[PDB]
Amino acid sequence: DYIPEPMDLSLVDLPESLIQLSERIAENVHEVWAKARIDEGWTYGEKRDDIHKKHPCLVPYDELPEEEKEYDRNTAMNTIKMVKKLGFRIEKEIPEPMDLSLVDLPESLIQLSERIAENVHEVWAKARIDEGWTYGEKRDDIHKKHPCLVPYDELPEEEKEYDRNTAMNTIKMVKKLGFRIEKED
């Protein structure tokens, strides 16, 4: 009965000087994900096992298949397209993450993390909903089942907290690269 309801982001007129740096934004997004999920004992594994704590993509960014780094580039850019979908302006001025903490973001955007975090889930769910996935209580790859195939308001808030700052660290990096971010009147 559930159908993801994300919006049309195509009309966003991002800067060209930002799309040329989608590599540096998707890169550390992997590293932040690589450091976080490696700090619980999970290690590299060609196959994936939740029990044995292994992951296929726990790699240096280049070791990821070109098909997936392409997706990580389009995952990140859609967030800043969403930030510009919220009436903002963007203009040019070892898993190793960066000290993006000092970056100051507008209060009128940090509030709107809910709209962005929801759409990232609704973007992520629509890909699996047309690749054959289905909502199950627990995960299985062969039968294509995943617990997070739920309406965003019904997701566990422990992962409703992960989506916002992940998308907003995808934004914290943008301003670290000198792309002004401010509300539009």
CATH number of the domain enclosing 145: 1.10.490.160
Q: Does residue 42 lie within any of the structural domains?
A: yes
Are 13 and 77 contacting, i.e. CB atoms less than 8 angstroms apart? no
Are 118 and 169 contacting, i.e. CB atoms less than 8 angstroms apart? no
Task: Count Cβ neighbours within 10 Å for each residue of 19-57 and write b for 16 or more, e otherwise.
Answer: eebbebbbbbbbbbbbeebbeeebeeeeeeeeeeeebeb
Place of tokens 């670290």: 176
Q: Which residues pair with 146 in a beta bridge?
A: 135
Q: Which residues are annotated as a binding site for Mg(2+)?
A: 50, 141
What would the two tokens of residue 94 be?
């070892």
C-alpha angle with apex 102: 87 to 21, nearest 5 degrees? 60
Total of domains in the chain: 1
Burial zone of 97 (CB within 10 Å; 0-12 exposed, 13-18 middle, 19+ buried): middle
Q: Which residues are annotated as a binding site?
A: 50, 141
Distance, CA of 109 to CA of 10 (rounded, Å): 20
Q: Does residue 162 lie within any of the structural domains?
A: yes
Could you tell me what percentage of the chain is helix, strand and coil, using 3-state DSSP and rounding each to the nearest 5?
50, 10, 40
**Domain membership of residue 99 as a residue range:** 16-183
Q: Does residue 3 lie within any of the structural domains?
A: no
Q: Does residue 169 lie within any of the structural domains?
A: yes
Place of tokens 């209060």: 107
Place of tokens 């089942």: 145
Residue partners of 164: CB distance under 8 A and separation at least 6: 113, 114, 116, 117
Place of tokens 């990096």: 173
Maximal C-alpha separation, the chain = 52
Are 179 and 91 contacting, i.e. CB atoms less than 8 angstroms apart? yes
Distance, CA of 164 to CA of 155 (rounded, Å): 13
Q: Does residue 64 lie within any of the structural domains?
A: yes
HSE, CB side, 13 Å, CA atoms: give it for residue 57.
18
Method used to solve the structure: X-ray
Q: Reported resolution in A?
A: 2.9
What would the two tokens of residue 96 be?
């190793």
Task: Give me the torsion for CA of 9, 75, 173, 63, rounded to 10°.
Answer: -160
Q: Does residue 151 lie within any of the structural domains?
A: yes
Q: Does residue 87 lie within any of the structural domains?
A: yes
What would the two tokens of residue 144 be?
């294509």
Q: Does residue 7 lie within any of the structural domains?
A: no
Residue partners of 10: CB distance under 8 A and separation at least 6: none
Report the candidate in 86, 146, 136 with the shortest Cα–Cα distance to residue 110. 86
